[PDB]
Enzyme design. Structure first.
Site, PDB file in Angstrom:
ATOM      1  N   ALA A  16       4.571  -2.094   1.863  1.00  0.00           N
ATOM      2  CA  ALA A  16       3.325  -2.042   2.631  1.00  0.00           C
ATOM      3  C   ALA A  16       2.282  -1.439   1.710  1.00  0.00           C
ATOM      4  O   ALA A  16       1.508  -2.139   1.091  1.00  0.00           O
ATOM      5  CB  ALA A  16       3.557  -1.172   3.860  1.00  0.00           C
ATOM      6  N   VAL A  27       2.532  -5.648   7.423  1.00  0.00           N
ATOM      7  CA  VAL A  27       2.410  -4.925   6.127  1.00  0.00           C
ATOM      8  C   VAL A  27       3.611  -3.987   5.957  1.00  0.00           C
ATOM      9  O   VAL A  27       4.391  -4.143   5.043  1.00  0.00           O
ATOM     10  CB  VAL A  27       1.109  -4.112   6.137  1.00  0.00           C
ATOM     11  CG1 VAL A  27       1.165  -3.003   5.090  1.00  0.00           C
ATOM     12  CG2 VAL A  27      -0.069  -5.039   5.828  1.00  0.00           C
ATOM     13  N   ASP A  28       3.740  -3.026   6.847  1.00  0.00           N
ATOM     14  CA  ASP A  28       4.872  -2.034   6.810  1.00  0.00           C
ATOM     15  C   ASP A  28       4.396  -0.722   6.323  1.00  0.00           C
ATOM     16  O   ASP A  28       5.186   0.093   5.893  1.00  0.00           O
ATOM     17  CB  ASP A  28       5.984  -2.420   5.841  1.00  0.00           C
ATOM     18  CG  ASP A  28       6.618  -3.748   6.258  1.00  0.00           C
ATOM     19  OD1 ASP A  28       6.712  -3.989   7.450  1.00  0.00           O
ATOM     20  OD2 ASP A  28       7.002  -4.501   5.377  1.00  0.00           O
ATOM     21  N   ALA A  29       3.140  -0.488   6.307  1.00  0.00           N
ATOM     22  CA  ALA A  29       2.739   0.766   5.767  1.00  0.00           C
ATOM     23  C   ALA A  29       2.622   1.701   6.897  1.00  0.00           C
ATOM     24  O   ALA A  29       2.945   2.846   6.791  1.00  0.00           O
ATOM     25  CB  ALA A  29       1.482   0.633   4.987  1.00  0.00           C
TER      26      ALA A  29
END
Length: 46
Positions: A16, A27-29
Site C-alpha cells: 500500500a 491499496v492496503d495502506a
C-alpha cells in the site's frame, strides 16, 4: 517481528504505502498507515 510481519503489512502496507483516489480499500495502506503503523510497529513494538 515486523520483518516477516514487514511482509504482514509491509507486504500489504509497503504494498500500500509502497490509489487512495478511491482504490485505497484496495491499496492496503489503511493498515500500512495505522496497522503498517503497527506492523511497522510489529517490529517497532518496543
Amino acid at each position: 517481528l515486523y520483518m516477516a510481519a514487514a511482509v504482514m503489512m509491509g507486504l500489504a502496507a509497503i504494498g500500500a504505502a509502497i490509489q487512495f483516489f478511491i482504490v485505497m480499500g484496495l491499496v492496503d495502506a489503511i493498515p500500512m498507515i495505522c496497522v503498517g503503523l503497527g506492523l511497522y510497529v510489529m517490529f517497532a513494538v518496543a
